[PDB]
RNA sequence: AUUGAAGAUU
RNA sequence: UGAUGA
RNA sequence: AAACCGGAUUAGAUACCCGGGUAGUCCACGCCCUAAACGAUGCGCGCUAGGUCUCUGGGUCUCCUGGGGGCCGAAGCUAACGCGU
RNA sequence: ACUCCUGAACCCGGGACGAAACCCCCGACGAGGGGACUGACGGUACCGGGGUAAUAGCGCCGGCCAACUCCGUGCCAGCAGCCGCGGUAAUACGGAGGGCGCGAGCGUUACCCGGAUUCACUGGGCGUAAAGGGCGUGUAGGCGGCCUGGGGCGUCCCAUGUGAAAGA
């Protein structure tokens, strides 16, 4: 049935970038969108937009890389080095504000969902609230 | 404050008494996952009033018997025989577990 | 406690001059002039290429052997230094350097640490006037370290304190030569000490 | 001139008609203690030419180690085969608390405060190779910023 | 295992076994001898090794090694036992403490004197 | 006696 | 079809 | 064709080879519940280059497009061997 | 060794705090003021004077692991935490010189945690290393696509009570 849609997205994304695709559809959900917004803003993706395919709502995700590279193996560095689900249907994961993780001494993000909406970790910390720890990303 | 618990009536087979199944759920100390867990309470129903399938509040009470220690505070909703159904089948699984 | 045995003899082995005698370890030997090599039947056969361990060992040996404080006591001071706030390698140095017996010597009242230690045990020293006979005594900043007026007479106190008339003293210390007394101004900054010793390696010896 | 420490020498052996035939392998690190290290694996009929040969390959294989005062930008774990290394940043005063293999490598990039763990297979060669890959993999605030601007 | 699985069964504590029923934990036990046989080692080892059968205050009767140059033990000898296998002699897992009870210390012993149980001798000392 | 030394062999 | 222990 | 009865072979031959032979192999009904019961690879779903052979549908039938069976092998994975829509 | 110097012990002299209340007197049996008795530790601690060069042991030195040489011994006697030493040249046995380590201690044995991501939540695996159930059906249970609204149980936040002393 597809059991964790948000896992899915992270994975679709993880997969498309390692073969350096320009873009990936992922079937669209409001929540998925909210996570994408962060990705976009935090400068991990170029951007994203709604689209249809076979006339059902998707989300094209435009991915983003580094420059062509030095010697044998000219593959660009990845912008999204690591994108990992934390909370999962098997095991939900929640943090109080005092215990939100700091991803790769701040060079990374942790999307995290609160009752004040979906936020990066600094975002959440600032508005002094915690919630479901969605994924890390660096 | 006298504890208030809310559950499902799964037995009226006793005079002035009801058995109430109260589910509780929480994060498992080591393994994290939110796990369910429940307990039946025998509660005081003096006007043999609440019946099989009612959802009720249960309130911490001055003792009535050995094991009667709660009284039926009120009714939340009637009908919920699915919940009783759940309990009953789980109960009958038990035969199909010995020798 | 404390060592007691052949000495300008590790002025040796540890590879480098420790002035443990002081008075002589200054003049055609810390024993170390005549034979700059390890002791015993084997000490001048070809150096064995020493292990990462060996190295760390000797280095702490070196440092400790300088203040002649015992392993038990040394270790306690180190653990003290670890858990304390700030850069643990240094602080440890500050702390060893705060031992009365060492300070008595840094002030020149004696010519060595082992000799200095005796003057402390034998009542010849005061701290802020009140007498103190503990080598291990922790000197804090602002403390005045006197010769005991009763002891001010002996051929030794004379000779050593006279010897100091010309002499310069620790940036972190002060010493009024005439009135036979010193002040402990501040604990020494790593830079103030010139110890033949890489402390980061000592820290490393107390890892595994 | 960089610094050069020998992490490992071993004697391997192959078989031929009547008798075995020995060889020597040498793991050598070279570093300027200022954010530049190299690993070198050199093998030869004799220890010296081997060690020496390592030296040569070490200098031909070098890394940007972005020190940030004694320590590294952030945490990394790297797997190399069954070998795994974790590298952790530390405030000054700590030291290089590592195993002999990555200590050697960290020390010669002039890392002075780092917390490490060897996990998985502890085989020196691969631990050393992971360590290098780990360092080779460190980014800094700057690089990230460049990457994400677009 | 899945996490549900760990919730269901959990991990299992690796709780492991003594090598030395000198029973009640006890760091030493007192026994009385029975045989003072000699035994051949195994492996690639050849020699005539000293052993006693010891009947213990544990209730237990077992074989123990008699360490050092030469002993003075026989049938009714009465001895303290310490644990320490022999490793060349499978089924020998306890040593006899030398210098306790009816076990003489090792005569003429200069070096590791503390084991073997022999007093500081007097010569030029 | 033999073996590097033994077991075995006169 | 066999080739005593290290 | 186990067993077993003989014939050879062999140092011997409770075996390999040869001549016989009962259970069994076959059927019905009831048991047994095992295996190198193997892809030594649990089941479902989503994602990630291609080439070529093949079974079986559909299309506008060079081909395109489903569902099986194969091999080679992007990225990747693996201790390696390998695995690889 | 030997020169000088200091002076643990030991001797002499002094000598505690710990104890100001109960009580009595004044006041008023109050408040407040005055007064007296009382020390097991103990002639101890501590202070002053005098003053003797005055105890060193245990473990270890093949590798891991810091520290090497000569005899003896000849798969013996023995060592041995694991790997392993000893078969006539033993840095591995026993002794000795020397050496390393710790020091009024040093070693041994037993037991607990560590290292052991070797029960793996943090943090493991199952083609050939140990590990896919012989295969299905489907009970409990676990898990559950996209949109909107209620509720607010989980979850998150603020305040507040609680979390004794010891310990840290
Ligand atoms: Mg792996
Ligand atoms: Mg392993
Ligand atoms: Mg054979
Ligand atoms: Mg042998
Ligand atoms: Mg495993
Ligand atoms: Mg298997």
DSSP states of C66-99: HHT--HHHHHHHHHHHHHSSS-HHHHHHHHHTTB
Dihedral (CA of E115, E118, E119, E125) sign: negative
Domain extent for C115: 97-193
For residue E96, the Cα-to-chain-centroid distance in whole angstroms is: 5
Instruction: Give CA–CA dist C112/C102, Å, rounded.
Output: 9
The answer to whether the beta carbons of residues C197 and C61 sit under 8 Å apart is no
Architecture in CATH of D1-64: 2-Layer Sandwich (3.30)
The answer to whether the beta carbons of residues E105 and E113 sit under 8 Å apart is no
Structure tokens at E121: 């001798």
CATH of domain D65-139: 3.30.230.10
Task: Report the distance from CA of residue E109 to the C1' of nucleotide I72 in Å, as an integer.
Answer: 15
Instruction: Give CA–CA dist D101/D99, Å, rounded.
Output: 5
Residue pointed to by tokens 């983003």: A64
Structure tokens at E112: 């590791």
Nearest to E106 by CA among E54, E76, E71: E71
Residue C90's CB is within 10 A of a number of other CB atoms, namely: 18
Nearest to A78 by CA among A42, A44, A39: A44
What is the resolution in angstroms? 3.1
Residue pointed to by tokens 């159904």: B85
CATH of the domain at A49: 3.30.1370.30
Please indicate, yes or no, whether residues C182 and C113 belong to a single structural domain of this protein. yes
Domain definitions of chain D by residue range: 1-64, 65-139
Dihedral (CA of E63, E65, E70, E72) sign: negative
Q: Which CATH number fits domain E1-125: 2.40.50.140, 3.80.30.20, 1.10.3720.10, 2.60.120.10?
A: 2.40.50.140
The answer to whether the beta carbons of residues E54 and E8 sit under 8 Å apart is no
| A97 CB closer than 7 A to any strand I atom | yes
Orientation of helix C88-96 relative to helix C71-83, angle to 10°: 130
Q: Count up the domains in chain C and report the number.
A: 2
Domain definitions of chain E by residue range: 1-125
Question: Which residues have beta carbons under 5 A from ligand 4 (an ion)?
Answer: E 44
Between residue 69 and residue 88 of chain E, the positions with Cβ below 7 Å from nucleic chain I are 69-70, 82-88
Please indicate, yes or no, whether residues C65 and C142 belong to a single structural domain of this protein. no
Structure tokens at B25: 């759920």
Spell out the SS3 assignment of E28-56.
CEEEECCCCCEECCCCCCCCCEEEEEEEE
Largest CA distance in chain C: 55
Interface touch B35/E7, C-beta < 8 Å: yes
Q: How far is CA C72 from CA C77, C78, C172, D110, E100, in A?
A: 9, 10, 28, 33, 32
The answer to whether the beta carbons of residues A112 and A134 sit under 8 Å apart is yes
Parallel/antiparallel/unpaired status of strands D114-120 and D5-15: unpaired
Q: How far is CA C168 from CA A25, C23, C107, C153, C164, in A?
A: 80, 17, 10, 23, 8
Structure tokens at C161: 């304190």
Q: Using the 8-state DSSP alphabet, how is residue C138 labeled?
A: B
Please indicate, yes or no, whether residues C102 and C181 belong to a single structural domain of this protein. yes
For residue C65, the Cα-to-chain-centroid distance in whole angstroms is: 8
The answer to whether the beta carbons of residues A8 and A26 sit under 8 Å apart is yes
Å between A135 CA and nearest CA of chain E: 18
Instruction: Give CA–CA dist E80/E31, Å, rounded.
Output: 6
C6, with CB counted inside 10 A (0-12, 13-18, 19+), is exposed
Instruction: Give CA–CA dist A89/E82, Å, rounded.
Output: 56
Instruction: Give CA–CA dist B32/B26, Å, rounded.
Output: 9
B93, with CB counted inside 10 A (0-12, 13-18, 19+), is exposed
Q: How far is CA B55 from CA B14, B72, B80, in A?
A: 18, 10, 7
Identify the H or E element spanning A89.
none
Within 8 A by CB and 6+ apart from D29, the residues are D4, D5, D7, D37, D38, D39, D40, D58, D104, D105, D108, D128
Identify the H or E element spanning E110.
none
Looking at the domain covering B1-99, what would its CATH class be? mainly beta
Domain extent for A137: 81-138
The answer to whether the beta carbons of residues A94 and A131 sit under 8 Å apart is yes
The answer to whether the beta carbons of residues C91 and C81 sit under 8 Å apart is yes
The answer to whether the beta carbons of residues D52 and D4 sit under 8 Å apart is no
Within 8 A by CB and 6+ apart from E123, the residues are none
Three-class SS of residue A88?
coil
């Amino acid at each position: 049935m597809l059991t964790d849609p948000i896992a899915d997205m992270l994975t679709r994304i993880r997969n498309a970038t390692r073969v350096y695709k320009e873009s990936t559809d992922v079937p669209a959900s409001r929540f998925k969108e909210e996570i994408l917004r962060i990705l976009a803003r935090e400068g991990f993706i170029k951007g994203y937009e709604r689209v249809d395919v076979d006339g059902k709502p998707y989300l094209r995700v435009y991915l983003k890389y580094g420059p062509r590279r030095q010697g044998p193996d000219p593959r660009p560095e990845q912008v999204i080095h690591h994108i990992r689900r934390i909370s999962k249907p098997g095991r939900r994961v929640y943090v109080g504000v005092k215990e939100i993780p700091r991803v790769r001494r701040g060079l990374g993000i942790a999307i995290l969902s609160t009752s004040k909406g979906v936020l990066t970790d600094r975002e959440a910390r600032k508005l002094g609230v915690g919630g479901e720890l969605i994924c890390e990303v660096w | 404050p006298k504890k208030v618990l809310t559950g499902v009536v799964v037995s009226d087979k006793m005079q002035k008494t009801v058995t109430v199944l109260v589910e509780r759920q929480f994060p498992h100390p080591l393994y994290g996952k939110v796990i369910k867990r429940s307990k039946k309470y025998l509660a005081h129903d003096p006007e043999e009033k609440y019946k099989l399938g009612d959802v009720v509040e249960i309130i911490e009470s001055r003792p009535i018997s050995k094991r009667k220690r709660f009284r039926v505070l009120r009714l939340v909703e009637s009908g919920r025989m699915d919940l009783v159904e759940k309990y009953l089948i789980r109960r009958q699984n038990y035969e199909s577990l010995s020798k | 406690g404390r060592y007691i045995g052949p000495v300008c003899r590790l002025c040796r082995r540890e590879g480098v001059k420790l002035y443990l005698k002081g008075e002589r370890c200054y003049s055609p030997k810390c024993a170390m002039e005549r034979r700059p090599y390890p002791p015993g039947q084997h000490g001048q056969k070809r150096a064995r290429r020493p292990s990462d361990y060996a190295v760390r060992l000797r280095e702490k040996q070196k440092l400790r052997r300088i203040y002649g404080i015992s392993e038990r006591q040394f270790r306690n001071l180190f653990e003290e230094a670890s858990k304390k706030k700030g850069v643990t390698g240094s602080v440890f140095l500050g702390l060893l350097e705060s031992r009365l017996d060492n300070v008595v010597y840094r002030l020149g009242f004696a010519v060595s640490r082992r000799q200095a230690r005796q003057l402390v045990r034998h009542g010849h020293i005061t701290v802020n006037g009140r007498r103190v006979d503990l080598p291990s005594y922790r000197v804090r900043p602002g403390d005045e370290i006197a010769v005991a007026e009763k002891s001010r007479n002996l051929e030794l106190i004379r000779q050593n304190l006279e010897a100091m008339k010309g002499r310069k003293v620790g940036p972190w210390l002060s010493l009024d030569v005439e009135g036979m007394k010193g002040k402990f101004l501040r604990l020494p900054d790593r830079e103030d000490l010139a110890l033949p010793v890489n402390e980061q390696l000592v820290i490393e010896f107390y890892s595994r | 001139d960089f610094e050069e420490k020998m992490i490992l020498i071993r004697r391997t052996a192959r078989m031929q008609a009547g008798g075995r035939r020995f060889r020597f392998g040498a793991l050598v690190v070279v570093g300027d203690r200022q954010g530049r290290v190299g690993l070198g694996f050199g093998k030869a009929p004799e220890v010296p030419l081997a060690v020496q040969k390592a030296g040569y390959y070490a200098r031909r294989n070098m890394v940007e180690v972005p020190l940030q005062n004694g320590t590294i930008p952030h945490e990394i774990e790297v797997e190399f085969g069954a070998s795994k290394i974790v590298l952790k940043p530390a405030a000054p005063g700590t030291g290089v608390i590592a195993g002999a293999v990555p200590r050697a490598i960290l020390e010669l990039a002039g890392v002075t405060d780092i917390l490490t763990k060897e996990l998985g297979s502890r085989n020196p060669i691969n631990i050393a190779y992971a360590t290098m890959e780990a360092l080779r993999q460190l980014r800094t605030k700057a690089d990230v910023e460049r990457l994400r601007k677009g | 295992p899945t996490i549900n699985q760990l919730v269901r069964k959990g991990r299992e504590k690796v709780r492991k076994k003594s090598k030395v029923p000198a029973l009640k934990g006890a760091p030493f036990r007192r026994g009385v001898c029975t045989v003072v046989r000699t035994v051949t080692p195994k492996k690639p080892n050849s020699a005539l090794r000293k052993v006693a059968k010891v009947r213990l205050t544990s209730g237990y009767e077992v074989t123990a090694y008699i360490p050092g140059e030469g002993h003075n033990l026989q049938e009714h000898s009465v001895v303290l036992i310490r644990g320490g296998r022999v490793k060349d002699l499978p089924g020998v897992r306890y040593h006899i403490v030398r210098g306790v009870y009816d076990a003489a210390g090792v005569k003429d012993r200069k070096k590791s004197r503390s084991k073997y149980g022999t007093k500081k001798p007097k010569e030029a000392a």
